[PDB]
Amino acid sequence: SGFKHVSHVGWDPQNGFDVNNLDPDLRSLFSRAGISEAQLTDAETSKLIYDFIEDQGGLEAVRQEMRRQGGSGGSQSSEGLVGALMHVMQKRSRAIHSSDEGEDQAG
Numbered sequence: 001s002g003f004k005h006v007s008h009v010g011w012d013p014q015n016g017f018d019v020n021n022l023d024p025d026l027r028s029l030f031s032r033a034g035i036s037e038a039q040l041t042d043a044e045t046s047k048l049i050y051d052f053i054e055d056q057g058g059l060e061a062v063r064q065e066m067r068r069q070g071g072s073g074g075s076q077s078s079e080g081l082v083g084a085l086m087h088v089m090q091k092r093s094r095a096i097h098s099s100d101e102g103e104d105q106a107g
């Protein structure tokens, strides 16, 4: 499997998440799913989560959607769009520390 390269993307395999300049809309898109700077301030998770802003069609590409699916925040239904990002984090939540499993030291 794989994905098709895109020059119109904002994220790249280097920096990660630009919280300092994170789009307002996108900002709430995270706080709603249950994600903090801790998950965005990690080059390891920054990519693991990019599968969302990447698959969704695009961060700015989502703004045009958020405008249709809702209004200006508030507190009306947390699902829809955000409910998906919650499932993407579950994948990492299920993993405790199996990736780094293999003790060789004795004593």
Ligand SMILES: CN(C)C[C@H](O)Cn1c2ccc(Br)cc2c2cc(Br)ccc21
Residues within 6 Å of the ligand: 006, 008, 009, 010, 011, 016, 017, 046, 047, 049, 050, 051, 052, 053, 054, 055, 057, 058, 059, 060, 061
């Ligand atoms: C349609 N796809 C292929 C294009 C990009 O994969 C979509 N995309 C963005 C577009 C604009 C900005 Br600004 C930020 C992002 C972004 C951030 C993360 Br993390 C993951 C995917 C992201």
